[PDB]
Design an enzyme around this catalytic site. Structure first.
Site, PDB file in Angstrom:
ATOM      1  N   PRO A 101       0.824  -1.211   0.000  1.00 46.70           N
ATOM      2  CA  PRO A 101       0.000   0.000   0.000  1.00 46.70           C
ATOM      3  C   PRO A 101       0.862   1.267   0.000  1.00 46.70           C
ATOM      4  O   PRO A 101       1.628   1.475   0.945  1.00 46.70           O
ATOM      5  CB  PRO A 101      -0.795  -0.106   1.306  1.00 46.70           C
ATOM      6  N   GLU A 102       0.724   2.060  -1.050  1.00 44.45           N
ATOM      7  CA  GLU A 102       1.479   3.302  -1.235  1.00 44.45           C
ATOM      8  C   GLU A 102       0.592   4.521  -1.057  1.00 44.45           C
ATOM      9  O   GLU A 102      -0.536   4.372  -0.564  1.00 44.45           O
ATOM     10  CB  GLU A 102       2.151   3.196  -2.609  1.00 44.45           C
TER      11      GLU A 102
END
Ligand SMILES: [Zn+2]
Length: 260
Positions: A1-2
DNA sequence: GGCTTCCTCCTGG
DNA sequence: CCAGGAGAAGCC
């Protein structure tokens, strides 16, 4: 998750928690990247005033402090209908007054649940680089910061000291869109290349936000990906089969013709 | 900066 | 049938 995924979670949860009250938390495994903070355990009837983001960290504003949530590599957030039964990796819940639940799931437990009275001072947010969507992150800054580097641009983009939120997926995607070889020495980019890179990084991140981030209800961005996880597949622009390499032992993907 | 490490879950091979 | 891959601290 960015950043796009974390930003997507913030927008998804905000209308559900803002104005509502935390009755208390339910913790079923407090051994995350760090131990769950004491204050989370003691939470009792606290209203949420705001849901913000800094880098890949979500920030819940309470009256006497802030809850800092990090998803690590496999964490996610859900607002659940009610007393829905938890699963084995559902390590932290926020039981809300509105009968809904904030449920955090994290098999690898590389995430974090932390408390800080003030955002400023120290903690995990200190020393974080500029937000990529901010005007603080630009081609002249980027150029400035690369001049002393001695290594490749791609891992440098994933270095939170330079800029936050650009992880393994958008580092590779951004360099493609800028047409820049990921093995290029950071120092060797021109001011102009830096200027274009900063621009496509913003465009790429803003795009993935718009479509709910990347799913590896899921995300709709994985289908717009040009290079990440497409080793061997034809470049969507030129058909040359996508090439894979590694930087600091993270996979990086590029097109040997479109990127130089 | 590069490498390794925490941890569990698929899967490509 | 299963080793290998899938953020960022904390070494260097
Ligand atoms: Zn190409």
């Amino acid at each position: 998750p960015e950043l796009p995924e974390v930003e997507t979670s913030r927008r998804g949860i905000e209308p559900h928690l803002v104005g509502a009250t935390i009755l208390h938390a339910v913790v079923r495994n407090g051994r995350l990247r760090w131990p769950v903070s004491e204050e989370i355990y003691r939470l009792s009837d606290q209203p949420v005033l705001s849901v913000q983001r800094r880098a890949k960290y979500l920030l819940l504003e309470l009256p006497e402090g802030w809850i800092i949530i990090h998803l690590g590599m496999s964490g996610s957030l859900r607002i659940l209908p009610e007393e829905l039964p938890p699963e084995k990796h559902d390590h932290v819940d926020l039981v809300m007054s509105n009968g809904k639940v904030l449920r955090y799931t994290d098999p690898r437990r590389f995430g974090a649940w932390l408390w800080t009275k003030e955002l400023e001072g120290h903690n995990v947010l200190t020393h974080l680089g500029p937000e990529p969507l901010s005007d603080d992150f630009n081609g002249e800054y980027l150029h400035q910061k690369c001049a002393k580097k001695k290594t490749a641009i791609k891992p440098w983009l994933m270095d939170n000291k330079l800029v936050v939120g650009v992880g393994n997926i958008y580092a590779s995607e951004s360099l493609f869109a800028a047409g820049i070889h990921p093995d290029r020495l950071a120092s060797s980019l021109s001011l102009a290349e830096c200027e274009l890179l900063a621009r496509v990084i913003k465009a790429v991140l803003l795009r993935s936000i718009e479509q709910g981030g990347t799913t590896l209800k899921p995300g709709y961005f994985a289908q717009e990906l040009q290079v990440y996880g497409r080793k061997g597949e034809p470049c969507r622009v030129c058909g040359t089969p996508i090439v894979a390499t590694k930087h600091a032992q993270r996979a990086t993907f590029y097109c040997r013709q479109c990127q130089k």
